[PDB]
Write a protein that binds this DNA or RNA. Sequence first.
RNA 1: CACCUCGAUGUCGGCUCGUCGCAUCCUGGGGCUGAAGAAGGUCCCAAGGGUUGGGCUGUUCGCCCAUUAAAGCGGCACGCGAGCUGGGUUCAGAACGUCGUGAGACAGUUCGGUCUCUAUCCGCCACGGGCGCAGGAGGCUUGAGGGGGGCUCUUCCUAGUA
RNA 2: AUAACCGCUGAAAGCAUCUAAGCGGGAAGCCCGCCCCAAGAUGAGGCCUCCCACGGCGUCAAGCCGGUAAGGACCCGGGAA
Lengths: 138, 205, 170
Amino acid sequence: MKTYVPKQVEPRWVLIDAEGKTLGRLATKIATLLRGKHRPDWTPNVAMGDFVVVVNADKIRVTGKKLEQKIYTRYSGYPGGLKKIPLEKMLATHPERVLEHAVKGMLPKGPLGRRLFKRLKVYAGPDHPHQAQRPEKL
Amino acid sequence: MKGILGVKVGMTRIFRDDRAVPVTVILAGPCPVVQRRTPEKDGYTAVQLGFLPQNPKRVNRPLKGHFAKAGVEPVRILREIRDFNPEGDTVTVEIFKPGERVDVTGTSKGRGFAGVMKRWNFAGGPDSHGAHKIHRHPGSIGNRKTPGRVYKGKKMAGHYGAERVTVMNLEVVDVIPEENLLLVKGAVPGPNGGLVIVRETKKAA
Amino acid sequence: SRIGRLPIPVPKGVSVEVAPGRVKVKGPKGELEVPVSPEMRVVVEEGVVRVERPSDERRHKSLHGLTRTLIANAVKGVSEGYSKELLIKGIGYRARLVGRALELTVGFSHPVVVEPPEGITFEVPEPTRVRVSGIDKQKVGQVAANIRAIRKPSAYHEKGIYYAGEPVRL
RNA sequence: CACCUCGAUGUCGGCUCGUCGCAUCCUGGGGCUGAAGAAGGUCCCAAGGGUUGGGCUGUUCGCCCAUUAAAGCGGCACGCGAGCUGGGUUCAGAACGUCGUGAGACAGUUCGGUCUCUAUCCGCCACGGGCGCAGGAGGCUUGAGGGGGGCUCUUCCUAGUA
RNA sequence: AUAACCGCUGAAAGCAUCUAAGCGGGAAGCCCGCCCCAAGAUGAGGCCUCCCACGGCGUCAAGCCGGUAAGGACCCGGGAA
Ligand SMILES: [Mg+2]
Ligand SMILES: [Mg+2]
Ligand SMILES: [Mg+2]
Ligand SMILES: [Mg+2]
Ligand SMILES: [Mg+2]
Ligand SMILES: [Mg+2]
Ligand SMILES: [Mg+2]
Ligand SMILES: [Mg+2]
Ligand SMILES: [Mg+2]
Ligand SMILES: [Mg+2]
Ligand SMILES: [Mg+2]
Ligand SMILES: [Mg+2]
Ligand SMILES: [Mg+2]
Ligand SMILES: [Mg+2]
Ligand SMILES: [Mg+2]
Ligand SMILES: [Mg+2]
Ligand SMILES: [Mg+2]
Ligand SMILES: [Mg+2]
Ligand SMILES: [Mg+2]
Ligand SMILES: [Mg+2]
Ligand SMILES: [Mg+2]
Ligand SMILES: [Mg+2]
Ligand SMILES: [Mg+2]
Ligand SMILES: [Mg+2]
Ligand SMILES: [Mg+2]
Ligand SMILES: [Mg+2]
Ligand SMILES: [Mg+2]
Ligand SMILES: [Mg+2]
Ligand SMILES: [Mg+2]
Ligand SMILES: [Mg+2]
Ligand SMILES: [Mg+2]
Ligand SMILES: [Mg+2]
Ligand SMILES: [Mg+2]
Ligand SMILES: [Mg+2]
Ligand SMILES: [Mg+2]
Ligand SMILES: [Mg+2]
Ligand SMILES: [Mg+2]
Ligand SMILES: [Mg+2]
Ligand SMILES: [Mg+2]
Ligand SMILES: [Mg+2]
Ligand SMILES: [Mg+2]
Ligand SMILES: [Mg+2]
Ligand SMILES: [Mg+2]
Ligand SMILES: [Mg+2]
Ligand SMILES: [Mg+2]
Ligand SMILES: [Mg+2]
Ligand SMILES: [Mg+2]
Ligand SMILES: [Mg+2]
Ligand SMILES: [Mg+2]
Ligand SMILES: [Mg+2]
Ligand SMILES: [Mg+2]
Ligand SMILES: [Mg+2]
């Protein structure tokens, strides 16, 4: 008896609110969603997961003094090319990155790890293209 | 933010107030605005500004009589002006009064493969004493085992020149509208007959 | 012992409205909005306005007094709440006034124009003494401070913008 | 100490080219002063940029001349010899002092004394070719993200006023 | 927008306190601004303007072969490239 393995199945689309939701807590879920690990036909080597849309990405809450104290770094190949960026500035400049970045780091690494990240459309505030479905959830 | 295209003509001195004034005569010919593109269908504001007329129809089908005054498409419509909305039609040298500073963007003369020392003003080696085939060489380019590599921007020999260069805050010594001439004093990049674009200064903006 | 926290403000020709996040006072001299901790419930009784804290935690007590006072000032505010003195000493030092704007010459190679922010009103009863009128009080104390901060007292002798008070030394 | 390296990890100093740290030499901002002013002292913030030319010695260092806003301290295999130098050290010649009967010996001295055309990979400076960007073309562009730059003195007015 | 720091308002702690809630000033530094690169930014963006929707095959999935169109190379005269 060989273990069952799904065929091309269904490209699902799911909508999430973000506003008021912590961040990592939300990221956790969005990740598990990204790689259909809720689906009972989960498969590690294929990418049979939901496409996730997220709105109100800028009203992500966050505890402690993270707005000032938490910093995102970026190293250019150059000398002294290590840039330091605090939450505040990010949100005020490029929200939807703060959450995109929290999910990128929670998806596995690899060519398949990527792609799963591609199946994630984060947007500032509300609104977005509504071509597919979007069974909103919590 | 008035801008205009033109060709570096030459250099010469002027004499004013019993003082020699070294200037660079640029011809800023009439520039037929051929497109505008606003935050409507573009997201910013500028002015396609076709220059030299020419073109005995070496113009092929990509021509734009769309915007009426194409007056036989020009050789180099290239380059807008960004945040400039002209006197409606045709921009000329009239946008500049003697006494205004301007920023000239040009294409610096090319020098091809230029060595460190010229490219970068390195001191090179000694021409005598120890010497030995390293007179115009860059010397050391690193350390030892750590980092064990060369920095990302290490100044080395390579192509140098023939690039975008903008000499800033140049005085407008004079303007001669009769012939579309404009006199700035000094250091406009590129060779004569090369194309330049003259803009408002950024000291005030 | 006996804490400027749970005593009670007052009324008299002025209104009070409790929102879950703040309170609006308003009176014969304008209106003020007082942002207050979402915790801590302010109640409007008869001709008073108590403030009570949820717990007794060293952190709720701290927010208690604060809140009480923070409101009371808003009440004094809408029925005369300005003031803050400002006596300019020193020889060549004099304070004029240009319309709404206050111009004072206090020893620089120039005079300083201190145009006033909204809500604030400037008066110069005699050229060597100023007063800052307002409803806020946080704004009054600020603007009053700023104006004086233009360098001033602390020196080696009576020269510069003083408050009414503060003597000085050598 | 003796852990990788003795079927080799070239050793001082200079030159060249840097880059980083800040326990800051200058410049910016501060608190205290036994801070009248000007000028200092001392501590705090601050690494953006700057941080001179000579005499002596192989020297590093240091002393000295003339300046300066200042003449900063360190790390990078006491950064850098498949980049240069080769004065020093550190083979073979020779000499002095010294030691040894001697051959010879000296972190003692002296004069001399072979520094090896070809870059495979990584890295770096440049410049292309290919394919991709799901119709194919010619123009004009947005800027995510990078990089460059960032120094300072004197005099004058204020005012010979506080 | 901040550092040291200077303050406003202000409790805990009646007084007082620049701070614990708040706010204001405040560095040659930080983020923008200037200059240059830059859509392989596979997240490959945009705008304008051109040619068009062939012939057989692939009977269906994406394709295969020719001519072609707008254009583009080849070749040649040259160039402060
Ligand atoms: Mg050339
Ligand atoms: Mg050069
Ligand atoms: Mg030179
Ligand atoms: Mg040099
Ligand atoms: Mg030299
Ligand atoms: Mg030379
Ligand atoms: Mg030699
Ligand atoms: Mg030679
Ligand atoms: Mg080496
Ligand atoms: Mg051993
Ligand atoms: Mg042992
Ligand atoms: Mg070996
Ligand atoms: Mg070897
Ligand atoms: Mg110390
Ligand atoms: Mg200093
Ligand atoms: Mg002094
Ligand atoms: Mg001091
Ligand atoms: Mg420090
Ligand atoms: Mg010598
Ligand atoms: Mg030294
Ligand atoms: Mg010595
Ligand atoms: Mg010296
Ligand atoms: Mg160094
Ligand atoms: Mg050592
Ligand atoms: Mg070494
Ligand atoms: Mg060598
Ligand atoms: Mg050496
Ligand atoms: Mg030798
Ligand atoms: Mg020799
Ligand atoms: Mg003997
Ligand atoms: Mg020996
Ligand atoms: Mg010798
Ligand atoms: Mg000889
Ligand atoms: Mg020797
Ligand atoms: Mg060699
Ligand atoms: Mg390798
Ligand atoms: Mg290419
Ligand atoms: Mg695509
Ligand atoms: Mg950018
Ligand atoms: Mg930089
Ligand atoms: Mg930058
Ligand atoms: Mg730099
Ligand atoms: Mg005198
Ligand atoms: Mg005076
Ligand atoms: Mg500010
Ligand atoms: Mg107080
Ligand atoms: Mg502050
Ligand atoms: Mg501020
Ligand atoms: Mg500056
Ligand atoms: Mg560009
Ligand atoms: Mg495109
Ligand atoms: Mg356009």
